[PDB]
């Protein structure tokens, strides 16, 4: 299980990774020094020679070069020594370990591997600086960030091993993934916070810029599109240009919760033929979503057309975004004078609602809910009395955050951030829980030696009435400290249990492949399914599609 099923191996490498906006989706930024070390045996062939004898000439430490040349006898000319390394006549047949080059096919990898996608194929763009670089989008299938992650890379060594890489494992071939019969790669952070930005109706772009963006899309046909506005000035809308990155025959249709072929809220999303007609672009569209633009452009146009889609949407949005810019300040976590006063009362009532329940229950007037104690239904009550207060105060803050608030903007864009992220920051942080129940009586019948015994009130049992913006008090803090920890503890234990689940899960099914009678079996020929998935189909090419026989009136059906 350690020297046969999983061996240590040659032609490998690893380094810190950093992301790269002007790198292609299927590309792997490989620093020059690694590129200098990893080889691919190439056989001397009438076609290549001239580029090959050149690669010998260059020697083993100036990029497009080589170490070792292998001959008839199968001897091994080392090119860092050898009296004949600035010489050598390349006979047909011989092998010529060469530096790994631009547009080779390499296997790129992050651990822990838990996918097909955790091992992709890439094309090697070689670069300066010591990091592997990758396209932001190739983030999810690898589960990378740049908080310090390292990544592996493996290099084929036969012509067929290369085939198998670029014909099966290549990133664009993985874009639409069998897992959730949806695609797995999207548009993230800036691109996604900027594409929303660019796109809202109020974003107008004048000539000088509209020329540069257009240039920026590599697949520009070199035809300025007519401006939406021709009047007092000519301007082009946000939507207007980005639409130049969207290839042709791409029709997309969404509609959201208020949306009527006029999108007053600029709701939803209609794309008639490579051009967007209404609605703000954002995740639901350009995400890793089901109906999304990526899902379509893949099936409709191709894999590699949609590989280069990530490229073009980014090259343009990035650029735009570079020049409008985007921040977050503690200004963005302040909320209205009255909204602060108005939030505090909104807590102060959940405060007298607990009081009044405890006041009630202590006088034995609390009815025990069926199948639970008096003690239990009072607990269940008070918790749902302070959660309904966090949410009520958090809402009351979310409603005050005007459209111009940078946090509320990444929430609309869906780049990072949630509701609760606001609720806690600007409003109040809410109850702290451990073991499932609110903060324990660790000390005899109290929580901290700063309280009396038998204090079931909100504060004493671990409600954090304050916001991260106002600041937690010493207890509030230590209570938070307790929860926080119970987190880390499972996130530590959670993941060890998991990677074991996976390990059997894998080891159980292992040998199940679809056989040439389209049947599903193991090594013995014991059938498991008689048609894979009960329908014969590969998950990659499946899609959500409404069956409009099922719903509707008996009448309206006939009609």
């Amino acid at each position: 299980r350690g020297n046969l099923m999983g061996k240590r191996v040659d032609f490998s490498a690893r380094t810190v990774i950093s992301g790269d906006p002007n790198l292609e989706l299927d590309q792997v930024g490989v620093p020059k020094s690694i590129a200098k070390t990893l080889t691919y045996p190439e056989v001397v062939t009438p076609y290549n020679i001239d580029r090959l004898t050149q690669l010998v000439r260059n020697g083993p430490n100036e990029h497009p070069g080589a170490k070792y040349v292998i001959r008839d006898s199968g001897d091994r000319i080392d090119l860092r020594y050898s009296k004949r390394a600035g010489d050598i006549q390349l006979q047909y047949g011989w092998k010529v370990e060469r530096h790994i080059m631009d547009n080779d096919p390499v296997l790129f990898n992050r651990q822990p591997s838990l996918h097909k996608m955790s091992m992709m194929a890439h094309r090697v763009k070689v670069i300066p600086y010591s990091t592997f670089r990758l396209n932001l989008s190739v983030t999810s299938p690898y589960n990378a960030d740049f908080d310090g992650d390292e990544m592996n890379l493996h290099v084929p060594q036969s012509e067929e091993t290369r085939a198998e890489l670029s014909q099966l494992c290549a990133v664009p071939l993985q874009i639409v993934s069998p897992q959730s019969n949806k695609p797995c790669m999207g548009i993230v952070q800036d691109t996604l916070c900027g594409i929303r930005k660019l796109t809202l109706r109020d974003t107008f772009i004048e000539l000088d810029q509209v020329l540069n963006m257009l240039y920026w899309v590599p697949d520009w046909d070199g035809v300025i599109p007519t401006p939406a506005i021709i009047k007092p000035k000519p301007l082009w809308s946000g939507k207007q240009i980005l639409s130049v990155a969207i290839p042709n025959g791409i029709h997309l249709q969404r509609f959201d919760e208020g949306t009527t072929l006029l999108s007053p809220k600029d709701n939803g999303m209609l794309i008639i033929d490579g051009q967007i007609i209404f609605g703000v672009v954002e995740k639901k569209t350009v995400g890793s979503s089901n109906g999304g633009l990526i899902h379509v452009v893949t099936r409709e146009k191709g894999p590699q057309v949609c590989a280069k889609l990530f490229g073009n949407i980014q090259k343009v949005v990035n650029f735009w975004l570079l020049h409008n810019g985007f921040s977050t300040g503690i200004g963005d976590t302040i909320a209205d004078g009255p909204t602060m006063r108005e939030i505090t009362e909104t807590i102060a009532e959940a405060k007298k609602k607990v009081l009044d329940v405890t006041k009630e229950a202590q006088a034995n007037l609390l009815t025990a809910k069926h199948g639970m104690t008096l003690r239990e239904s009072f607990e269940d009550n008070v918790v749902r009395f302070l959660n309904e207060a966090r949410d009520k105060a958090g809402r009351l803050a979310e409603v005050n955050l005007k459209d111009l608030n940078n946090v509320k903007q990444m929430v609309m864009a869906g780049s990072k951030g949630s509701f609760i992220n606001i609720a806690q920051m600007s409003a109040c942080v809410g109850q702290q829980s451990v073991e499932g129940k609110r903060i324990a009586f660790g000390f005899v019948d109290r929580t901290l030696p700063h309280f009396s015994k038998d204090d079931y009130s909100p504060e004493s049992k671990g409600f954090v009435e304050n916001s991260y913006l106002r600041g937690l008090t010493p207890q509030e803090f230590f209570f938070h400290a307790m929860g926080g920890r119970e987190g880390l503890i499972d996130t530590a234990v959670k993941t060890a249990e998991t990677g074991y689940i996976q390990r059997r899960l894998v080891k159980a099914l292992e040998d199940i492949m679809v056989h040439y009678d389209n049947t599903t079996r193991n090594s013995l020929g014991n059938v498991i399914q008689f048609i894979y998935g009960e329908d014969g189909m590969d998950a990659a090419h499946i899609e959500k599609q409404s069956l409009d026989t099922i719903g509707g009136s008996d009448a309206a059906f006939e009609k």
Binding site: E42, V43, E159, E160, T161, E164, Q167, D517, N518, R521
Partner: protein
Amino acid sequence: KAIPKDQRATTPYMTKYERARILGTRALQISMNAPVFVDLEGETDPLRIAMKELAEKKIPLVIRRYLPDGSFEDWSVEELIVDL
């Protein structure tokens, strides 16, 4: 056992694996300067040849498929349709 040119359930569509492995096997042979069966239209990459060799169905390999009972089916890269 056998299994004659008739009575065959096996997909007359080329499995990506079949193809990826033909494209490789040819891309092997080619790279070791075996002769090439189409006019290299300014192409010299031993693999990007084999794709042109395959788009023009001039690859003389027989995919021998295998059914669980031990029996098997032959198919030329001729009969085989490359859709993908």
